Structure formats: structure tokens, C-alpha cells
Amino acid sequence: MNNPLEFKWLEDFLSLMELGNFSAAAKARFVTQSAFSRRIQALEVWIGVPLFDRTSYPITLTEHGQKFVPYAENLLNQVKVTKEDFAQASLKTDHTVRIVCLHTLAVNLLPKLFLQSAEALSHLNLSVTPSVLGIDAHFQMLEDHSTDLLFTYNISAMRPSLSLEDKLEKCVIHSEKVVPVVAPRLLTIPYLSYSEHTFLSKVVEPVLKTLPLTLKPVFETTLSESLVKMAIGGAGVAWVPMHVIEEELAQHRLVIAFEEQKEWQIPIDILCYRSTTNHRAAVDQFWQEID
Amino acid sequence: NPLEFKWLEDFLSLMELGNFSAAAKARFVTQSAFSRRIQALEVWIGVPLFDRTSYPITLTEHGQKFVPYAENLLNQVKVTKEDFAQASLKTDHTVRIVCLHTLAVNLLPKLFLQSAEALSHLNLSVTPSVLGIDAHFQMLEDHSTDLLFTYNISAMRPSLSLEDKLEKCVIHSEKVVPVVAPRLLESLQTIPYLSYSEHTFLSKVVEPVLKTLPLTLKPVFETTLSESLVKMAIGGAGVAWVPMHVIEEELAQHRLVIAFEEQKEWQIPIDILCYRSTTNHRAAVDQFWQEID
Amino acid sequence: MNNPLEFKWLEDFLSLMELGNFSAAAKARFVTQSAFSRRIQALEVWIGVPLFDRTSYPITLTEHGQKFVPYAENLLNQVKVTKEDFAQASLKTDHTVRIVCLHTLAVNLLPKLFLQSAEALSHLNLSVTPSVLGIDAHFQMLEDHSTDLLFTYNILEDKLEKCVIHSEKVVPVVAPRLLIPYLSYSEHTFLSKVVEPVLLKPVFETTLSESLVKMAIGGAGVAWVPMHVIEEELAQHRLVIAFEEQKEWQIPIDILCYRSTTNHRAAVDQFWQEIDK
Amino acid sequence: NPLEFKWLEDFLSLMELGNFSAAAKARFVTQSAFSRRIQALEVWIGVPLFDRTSYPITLTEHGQKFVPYAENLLNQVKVTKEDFAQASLKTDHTVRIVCAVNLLPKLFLQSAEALSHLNLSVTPSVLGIDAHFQMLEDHSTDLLFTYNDKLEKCVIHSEKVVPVVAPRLLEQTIPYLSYSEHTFLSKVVEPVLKTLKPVFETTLSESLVKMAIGGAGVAWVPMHVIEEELAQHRLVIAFEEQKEWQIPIDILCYRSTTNHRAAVDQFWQEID
Numbered sequence A: 001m002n003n004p005l006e007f008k009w010l011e012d013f014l015s016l017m018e019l020g021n022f023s024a025a026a027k028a029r030f031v032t033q034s035a036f037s038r039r040i041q042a043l044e045v046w047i048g049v050p051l052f053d054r055t056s057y058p059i060t061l062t063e064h065g066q067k068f069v070p071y072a073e074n075l076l077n078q079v080k081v082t083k084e085d086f087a088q089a090s091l092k093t094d095h096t097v098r099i100v101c102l103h104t105l106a107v108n109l110l111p112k113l114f115l116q117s118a119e120a121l122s123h124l125n126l127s128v129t130p131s132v133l134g135i136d137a138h139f140q141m142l143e144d145h146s147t148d149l150l151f152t153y154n155i156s157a158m159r160p161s162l163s164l165e166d167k168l169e170k171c172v173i174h175s176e177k178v179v180p181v182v183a184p185r186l187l188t189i190p191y192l193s194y195s196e197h198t199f200l201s202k203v204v205e206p207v208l209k210t211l212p213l214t215l216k217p218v219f220e221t222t223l224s225e226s227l228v229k230m231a232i233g234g235a236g237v238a239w240v241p242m243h244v245i246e247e248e249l250a251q252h253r254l255v256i257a258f259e260e261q262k263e264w265q266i267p268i269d270i271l272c273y274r275s276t277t278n279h280r281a282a283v284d285q286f287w288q289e290i291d
Numbered sequence B: 001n002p003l004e005f006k007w008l009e010d011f012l013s014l015m016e017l018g019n020f021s022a023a024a025k026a027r028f029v030t031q032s033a034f035s036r037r038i039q040a041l042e043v044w045i046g047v048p049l050f051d052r053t054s055y056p057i058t059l060t061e062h063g064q065k066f067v068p069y070a071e072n073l074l075n076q077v078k079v080t081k082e083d084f085a086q087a088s089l090k091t092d093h094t095v096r097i098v099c100l101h102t103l104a105v106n107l108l109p110k111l112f113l114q115s116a117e118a119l120s121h122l123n124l125s126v127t128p129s130v131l132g133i134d135a136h137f138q139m140l141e142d143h144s145t146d147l148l149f150t151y152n153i154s155a156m157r158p159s160l161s162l163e164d165k166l167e168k169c170v171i172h173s174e175k176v177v178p179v180v181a182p183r184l185l186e187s188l189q190t191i192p193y194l195s196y197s198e199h200t201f202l203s204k205v206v207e208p209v210l211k212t213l214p215l216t217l218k219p220v221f222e223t224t225l226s227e228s229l230v231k232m233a234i235g236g237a238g239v240a241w242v243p244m245h246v247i248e249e250e251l252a253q254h255r256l257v258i259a260f261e262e263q264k265e266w267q268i269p270i271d272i273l274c275y276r277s278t279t280n281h282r283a284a285v286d287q288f289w290q291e292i293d
Numbered sequence C: 001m002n003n004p005l006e007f008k009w010l011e012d013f014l015s016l017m018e019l020g021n022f023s024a025a026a027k028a029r030f031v032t033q034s035a036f037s038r039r040i041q042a043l044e045v046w047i048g049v050p051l052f053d054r055t056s057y058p059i060t061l062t063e064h065g066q067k068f069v070p071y072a073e074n075l076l077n078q079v080k081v082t083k084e085d086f087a088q089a090s091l092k093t094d095h096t097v098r099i100v101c102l103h104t105l106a107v108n109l110l111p112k113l114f115l116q117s118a119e120a121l122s123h124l125n126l127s128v129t130p131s132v133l134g135i136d137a138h139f140q141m142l143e144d145h146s147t148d149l150l151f152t153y154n155i156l157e158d159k160l161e162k163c164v165i166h167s168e169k170v171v172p173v174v175a176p177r178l179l180i181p182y183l184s185y186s187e188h189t190f191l192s193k194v195v196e197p198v199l200l201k202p203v204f205e206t207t208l209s210e211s212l213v214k215m216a217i218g219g220a221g222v223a224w225v226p227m228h229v230i231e232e233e234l235a236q237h238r239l240v241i242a243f244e245e246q247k248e249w250q251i252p253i254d255i256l257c258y259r260s261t262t263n264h265r266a267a268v269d270q271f272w273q274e275i276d277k
Numbered sequence D: 001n002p003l004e005f006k007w008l009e010d011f012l013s014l015m016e017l018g019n020f021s022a023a024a025k026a027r028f029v030t031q032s033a034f035s036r037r038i039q040a041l042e043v044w045i046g047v048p049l050f051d052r053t054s055y056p057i058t059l060t061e062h063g064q065k066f067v068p069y070a071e072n073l074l075n076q077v078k079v080t081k082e083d084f085a086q087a088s089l090k091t092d093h094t095v096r097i098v099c100a101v102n103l104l105p106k107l108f109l110q111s112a113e114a115l116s117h118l119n120l121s122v123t124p125s126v127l128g129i130d131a132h133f134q135m136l137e138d139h140s141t142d143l144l145f146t147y148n149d150k151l152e153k154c155v156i157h158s159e160k161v162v163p164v165v166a167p168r169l170l171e172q173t174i175p176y177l178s179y180s181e182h183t184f185l186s187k188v189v190e191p192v193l194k195t196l197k198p199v200f201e202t203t204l205s206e207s208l209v210k211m212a213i214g215g216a217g218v219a220w221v222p223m224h225v226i227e228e229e230l231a232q233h234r235l236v237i238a239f240e241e242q243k244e245w246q247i248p249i250d251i252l253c254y255r256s257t258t259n260h261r262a263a264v265d266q267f268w269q270e271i272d
């Protein structure tokens, strides 16, 4: 089960039909002339007959290519209509702003931002979900406009893929440190860690061999807010972003470990991304406020 | 001649950072070896990918066409690894726990802390997950995870029975209550409503009861995260229906008040379950399970 | 070209829809459990909204999932109609046997075979298309019935009947006056992949065995070529095999015919039984 | 540890041949090297891919799931290389030629002493007229051979497409040996011809030549393809007195006027 139709071939066929020239069509499809010739060939293998005569000038349709024209458009339009009909299903209303961020930004940063701008945003219905699908999946949704903004850290692992950068705008929301914290009682030490897969594990783990203490891992999760609850409860040392523990540091239920050894801290920037082509007014009024 | 897999990330890394030195550090090799890798990649592909005489370094026309090839291969290699990855157990005193994101911050740590000296000797690994209950039941069966915490499941349609495979116990019974910031209490007309996304358990529990009500709730804000509703409600953005266990501290600090105290039947009952595999007898899992009952 | 719809997601959708269990849908789709779950997510990301209700056991459709059902069916149906409306579009007459082979075989083997059987084959028309496509493309066209027979070299398959036509060696040959300049197959060609690992100053490189031979007959250097191509020249001593005593430099090959088990047109089976021997 | 792509071909060889000695030979490594590679791939993917509990070796269930992944990954490497491949310039004196079997050898040998030091890469080609002419000015090819704007051109020779038959044939409708529908020579012959009975079809002149030598019918072929078969009385020209059913055609060579390679120019000065 692996000779499937690839829809890209349908556009390749339409482009060569219209332009009559392998070099021009490849350019219009953003691929090398060889990539493009191979794709047309793969289409012809799949449909089973040659669609183009290469011995005429310019390239023309065969008898079979003529017959195939309505089949190519028919499918291409069905995919388009499918994409368009469901593009609006994400939108409750045209004044709702769809937002994806790290869980700890969904609980600490985003409400603080709306609440501070509550009057200037009072007409907007924010819809806030945490990042859970994988960084590339969420950026694809941003580019497709099924998501309006994306709040991330400026870590390497949360960068948008290189092919996508040109299509996105980003602004900095503020700067921060990831710092180690414990409850007042302090001295081997119980370690409260990020699961090795998630984004913050890669920021913190290199810093940790510089550490002089042996670390007794007793709890790992993916969410900073979970580590914070255990650090409060006296369970170990965790690395957490500062603007997760503001009042906790004030109430002295937590305190920074080796406070004046700033190189066991990691500076990070909170980023907000949008698609340059997403011109929905509700999204624009929101972006104007936090930027 | 063999294409070398790490040339691809080598390529991506030098395309992003503008320079060899930074790219070589990002890839944890000598400035030296990085150069040699980039050169082997260019020899192999047959054309220059990088215009090296530009500062910062840019891609050639070829390098620009090369971008999707490197990403697809990288992605297809990673996808090959993840599709075949097996269940893992780090240490034999690690308890593997799966649940929704919300439960992972306001239920499990409280549970864990309340049994510290009993559970202190175990290693707890909590991976929140938006995969379905069907996915998590399957993980219990595969012993790829040990415990699942969840809100009770009303079946959409008749389903195969489970107690030949899974055991279930009740962690907590409580209510989902409407809360509001104290300043807003006397204004309670048309009320701003801080609601759950339609594809959460709590929406499917709250909205049925909410339609049966003489309120005019205008949705001003939507989320999957109970903890976000709570922040919004503290700031007076409107009324939220939230589980009691998420607001224990806010109610004690008088930063939130239950609204419509008089109408107890506007508080929606809810159970939090812990599921386990019947064929899984690890003493770490039993020590954990025997403590929550 | 960033984010294509992938046809197979449509079948993944319908299969999870009807079975309501990730593990069972995955088995039905012949993929691993985590590959299926990943593919389902790719479909939901692409469309932009969840199609399956994740709080439910068994899994059931969201309202968006319910809405999406005709879209998926109609796409799949259209792809199927496209394939149907073009099946056997290449088949001109019904007494036509469509043949694909390598260039080397289209001149040195196939004409010799039809003549050898001219009167058992007189009622047929043969279209011989020498082809450069991968063997996998040729196998797929056999399954689709886009061609009828495949002749090739050698050293899915439950729908493909094969048969050995001739066993042979690729041997180094040279004009007698010589006792080293190299006449080679271009990188991509099949015999290239065959000869080189078993292996000289390059002087001439092409795809076609018969170009090598003319150059070899002309004293231009040494070429490796299948034996059947050079039977006359060996007889007439226009070529001799080089280091003939040392079978080390000679590569055995096999000349194969494949047909699809699902193609039962008379004209093909007739051709085949004269071929099988 | 990183994936090595030669493992994927190692996997497919063992799957096809079902035996370690045979699989190692087909991959040109020692049996022990082949073994260490198979084990390294099984460690990398994390599950056993081969069922060693019998002979021939078969695939595990996961091994059978892994098959499409090996093929896909290997296809994508191969496409990556081909989509960028170009300009096979092994020597300062390599001549990359695009075009026709009998032509190039005859021409090389006709002046081998003058082109001793060169080496030729000849390639049979069916992309566009446009595409190939661009490649000449892209300097990705040095020479373009073809039948009949800053491109010098050269008459190889002007010859004639003629109909040929085995002498054994005295004769009315006739078995007709034709070029396939979408080839250049079809566009030259079928217009002139407009009773023939289709009997055999292909794209290759040399293939039609052998059918005609066996007497299977009449074919039109360029004479530079049959100069020897005529001299050997194996084919004659049909309808000799019908001198107007022979299509006159030219053979041309093209080179870019900015492609200033000495080897290219040396070849070109022998050709004209």
C-alpha cells in the first residue's frame, strides 16, 4: 500500500500544461528542473499513460493529458473546498483570538496580560490552550491560520523550522531567568526535574554537571507548575521560571538556591509569534496591545 | 558514497546561526570537524549550498532548494524511530503516571505531598497527555504506564467491559462550583462567563447543567486549563465553574467566593478516578495504589 | 510546498471512525500503533480542528469529525474514479501486448524472441517501450495493468509471476590487438550498479551496452557487456573476452520476465506460454 | 547513535535472500561485517527485525512493518542526489554529450588519435528541446546532438530516412514496423506516409532494424543506422524507384558560444 497519489502532482500537471516548458514550470513550483521532471514522471506512472509529449515544441498535452485536465482540477478543488470549509470551524466568532502557549504561560503570563489590558480587549474572546501537539505541529497551525498567536520561549528546540521563518513575525514579551528554588529548609539533595523529552530539559541539563551537588531524582514531569508545587511542599530543588514564583518568593514559601551564583540560572526570552498573512482585525487589536 | 545523517542537522544549524563557529558549538563538535562535515555534504550533493563569501553566510540558489530535502529526511528519520519506540522503565522504583494537564498540577502534587514519608522512597514520573482515554487504557494494558488519573467517563455508546484488564478506584468526589472575585459578587443580569473548550471533559459536564439555568452567560474567555479560569476569575473577568480541588487555597485566601451559595444544585458532582492494570504487579505501583484508598 | 493532504489519512480516518480504537484501527491499516496515532494527529493538524472526541471510550467523532465524513468519502471516491477512467488507457487494440524492458534487451533479445516464435505470435501486436524508470515503477505498472510484461536483469511479489528466460555472464571484452582504458556504464544505469562493485582509465561512458560494443570493436578499450549481446563478434573474432581464463572478472546475471497474476487477457497469456519454456 | 543508510540496504538484502552468506555477498562485505551491521540496525530501531528461529531468516512482525520505512528513506536519499546531480566533469578534458547509438562511436573512432586525451560522457535524453538547449547555455552539457539563440550549430551529415525490408519479401497490405506515438521519428515518418498493417511498435531504430532483418515487415530507418546491414545484403531498400518516400533529414551538433573549455573545442574542431 505505497503507490498513493500525491496531490502535489496535480498542481505540477496544471503548471506544465499552462506553461509548456519544464524549466518554467519547475520555477513556478519552487523546485529544481530535475525534481519537477521526476514528479511529472511519477504522476504518469501512477495514472498509467504519458500525459505530455516531450518531442513536440513546446511541451504539449497528449490525448491522455487532455482527458486528464478535468480530473486534476476536480480533485484539487475538492481538497481546497475541504480546507476552506473547515478553516472557519476553528472560529467560534470573528472576534475570537485563538492562542497556544506553554502551559505555564497559559496560566501565569496570558491572564496577567489580558487583565492589565482588560478595557482595551473587552470586545475580544480569548481562547487559550497549552502547547501539546509538538512545536512543528503548532507552527504549521499558525501558518495555516487555524491558530492566531503562539507564545514560546526563544530556545533552539522551540524555533520554527527554517523553511517557515520567512512567513512569521515575532516580538519579545519580556526577559526572564530560570532559577533553582527550594523551600526554606536547605542543606545529597532531592532533584525535581523536567522529563527528558520536553523543551526545558535541554535548557537545564547542561547547567547541571557544573553543579557540585549530587542530585537525587525523586520526581519528574513536563510542567513547571508541577515542579513548583513540589518545591513549595519541601520535596527538592527544581529549576523554574521566575515569573511563575513571584508571590511565592515574596511570601518566602520558596527561595532561590545559591542565590548569588548567577551561572546556575538560565536567561530566556518569552516570544509571541503570528503569521504575517493573518490580518484578522481581532488578532491585530490583540497584537497591538502586547507588543 | 554514503550520505551521512548528521550533515542534515549540520546544514540546518549553519543556515540558522549565521556562522561556522556558532553552528559548530550548536552541534557539539570542533570548529574544525564542522567545516569538514559541511564540505563533505557539499562534495556529496555536487553543488555549493552556502555562499561562504557573504557575511552573514547565506544559502545559494541550490541551498534554498535543499532546505525541504534536509527537513523531510530529518523528519522521516525521526518518525522512523518514534514509530518503533518501545515501552521503557527507568528504575524498578519508578511509578509511571499519565493524566490530563490540569490534574497534573493541582491533584497529583497534593496527593504526592500528603503521603510524602509513605511515597518518599518511590520515583514519580508524571507525563500529562491529551491522547484519549482509549490511548491511556491501551498504555495500561501494554504496561508502558502504571497509573492513569482521570475524570469519570460517560460512554457515548455501548462499549466492551474492562475489569478483566483494568482496575479502577475513586480518588476524590467533589463538586464543580461557580466562583467569582469578591468585588463582583453583588453585580450577580448578563454575566461574563469564563468557560471550558468544548472538547474537554469539564465542558461536557458543565454545559449540560448550564443550559438548565436562569442565567444569561456571555462567553468572554475559553480554555482547556482550569488553572487559567481561576486566574481570570480572581481578576474579576467573570464567573467560572471550576472543581473544588483547584481553588482550595483561593477560597482560604478569600480571593474567590462561591457564587449562588444558596443554589447547591448548580454545583455539578464529579469523581476523579485512578485506573491500573490487573496484570501489573510491581511493588512500587502497589505501594502507591495502597496509599490512595 | 509545505503541508500537503496525504491520501492515506482519509483511510486512517474512516478506519478509526468505524472501529473506535487506536490499536485496532492501526492493525487494520498495517501500521504500528504509534504510527497510526501520529498519522491521525497529522490529519487533525492539517484540517485545523479535532475530528475525534478524546474523552470518549470507544472513541467517537466530534461534530467536526461528523461533518468531515462526506469530504473524505468523496475524495477517496474521486481518486478511485480517476484510476478507473484511465485503466488500460495505453491499450490500443486487444491483440496488443505492452512490453517494458531495458534498452539493452529491446534490441539484443526481444526481436530475437519474437522472430524465434513468429508464427505462434502472428496474431499479436507488440509495443516494446524501453524504459529508464525504477524497477519499482515497472512493477507498479504491472499491478495496475498499465503494461503487460516486464523483461529485465537480475542476479508485491504475490501478485507477480516471474520466470527465468536466460542465464548469462557480464564479461570483459576487447578488440584482439590489445593486451587499461575503460568503457563504462553511466552511474545511474543498472549494469553500472552491477559491474562497479565487482571492480583503469575512463575514456567513454554511456548507458547503452551496444555503444560500449562499437567502441570496444573499434579498439578503444575494455568493456563489460552481457554475453548475448556479443555472440557474433566473438564468433568472428572482432572481440575476445579479456582474461578469459579467470572467471573472477565475470558476473553472472539472469534475464527475467515478470507478469501480474491478476492480468488474464488472452493475448498476454498466449505470449507468456511461448516464453516460459 | 546515528542511523547509517547502508543499514537499510543491508536489511533489504537479508529480507530478500533469507541467508547471511548470500546477503553479505550481495552487499560486497564480509559475512561478519554484514552481521555487525544487521545487529547495529536492530539496536538502533530498538526491536528485532529478523526472526532467527528458522532458516531462511524471515521478518518479525515489526520487521514487516519496517519494510516501507527502509524503502521510503532509501528512495528519499536517492531523490535528493538525483534532483541536484549535474556536470559530471571527471577530467579537465571530459566532454559531456547529450542526445542515437551508432552516431557517437563512429564519430569518436573516426578521429580517435586527435581525441585520444579526451574522455566522453554520452547520455541518452528525452526531456524537452527547450530543456536541453538551456543546459547547453547552463554549461551543464557541452554538446547537443539531434536531428533538425546564442548557440553555434553544425551539420553532422544530411541523410535520408528510408524504408527497409528483408530481401525474402516480394510484395497489397504489409506488416508495418513503426516508431511509437510520442517520439521524434514518429513525427517525421507518419506525416509523409499519409496500406500498412501495424505489427510491431517501439521507440528504437536499431530494434526496428532487427525485426526487419527477420522479415517481420517494413520499417523506415535512418540510413546511418543500416549502412552495414545493406552492405551485407541483409536488408534492401523497398520501393527503390519511389525516390520520394525517403524523408531527407539532418543531423546537428550544438555548443554554447560562452562554454570556453579547451576539450569541448577540440572535439568540435574534429566534428565540423
Ligand SMILES: [Br-]
Pocket: A003, A004, A005, C007, C079
Ligand atoms: Br491512490
Ligand SMILES: [Br-]
Pocket: A044, A045, A048, A049, A050
Ligand atoms: Br508512463
Ligand SMILES: [Br-]
Pocket: A131, A132, A133, A134, A135
Ligand atoms: Br508541544
Ligand SMILES: [Br-]
Pocket: A102, A103, A104, A105, A222, A223, A224, A225
Ligand atoms: Br510549562
Ligand SMILES: [Br-]
Pocket: B088, B089, B090, B091, B094, B096, B125
Ligand atoms: Br520511566
Ligand SMILES: [Br-]
Pocket: B100, B102, B200, B201, B202, B203, B224
Ligand atoms: Br478537562
Ligand SMILES: [Br-]
Pocket: C101, C102, C133, C134, C135, C138, C151, C152, C153
Ligand atoms: Br527494470
Ligand SMILES: [Br-]
Pocket: C102, C104, C189, C190, C191, C192, C207
Ligand atoms: Br543496463
Ligand SMILES: [Br-]
Pocket: B005, B077, D001, D002, D003
Ligand atoms: Br538517528
